[PDB]
Amino acid sequence: XXXXXXXXXXXXXXXXXXXXXXFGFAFIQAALQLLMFMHMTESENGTIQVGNTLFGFFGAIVIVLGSIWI
């Protein structure tokens, strides 16, 4: 019941993503996954769980924006 609101909101981000082509477009991609994964982390094993994935995207920025940085 409550998860359908996010799923319905998720489909519009892809439709707005096509409207961008057919920063400002590098953020709508990360924001699409925030709402997707926010429904299954905390808590109990959380803090560590939702914390493990945070520093992985840093490497993605470090690896991507670092490789492009040359």
């Binding site: 998860x3 993503x17 996954q33 997707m36 299954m40 493990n52 994935t53 991507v64």
Partner: protein, 178 residues
Amino acid sequence: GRLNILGFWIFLGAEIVLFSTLFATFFVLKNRTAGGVLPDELFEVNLVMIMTFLLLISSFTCGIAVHEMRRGSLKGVVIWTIITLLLGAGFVGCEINEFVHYVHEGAALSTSAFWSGFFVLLGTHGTHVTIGIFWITGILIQLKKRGLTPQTSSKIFISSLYWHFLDVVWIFIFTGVY
């Protein structure tokens, strides 16, 4: 209480660097094809692939919340986990005919340096989504001589959340390569 939910979770964080390495590989190999074919791919197939997968999670974010967590739809496991299993073949079947149609100029990884990254950034990409089908169907052999209850049969959740991690880079591939 099972810590495999957390152990095979930090394994999901490792794949972020896996795909970021391919994303760094691909993003540096973007301006090549100095001698070869320039990339022109079908646009409607991209949204059809992405909207099929964006609807794949829509039947899975609620596929365990209003399933095992809310109330107890034990009979619906052969309903919500099977319908979401057929959607996994939609991405496999569409990406296979996408690669076979790419045999027509730009086949495999030998035509250009750029098509090497794309057939691998989406290659092991396609491999991760293919083994998930065999992992999601690997737990479906439990409603026979087993049939465990929630908070005990962790195989569904640890394989459900692994299946969720695909759509993350799947969307980042949507913005990355397209």
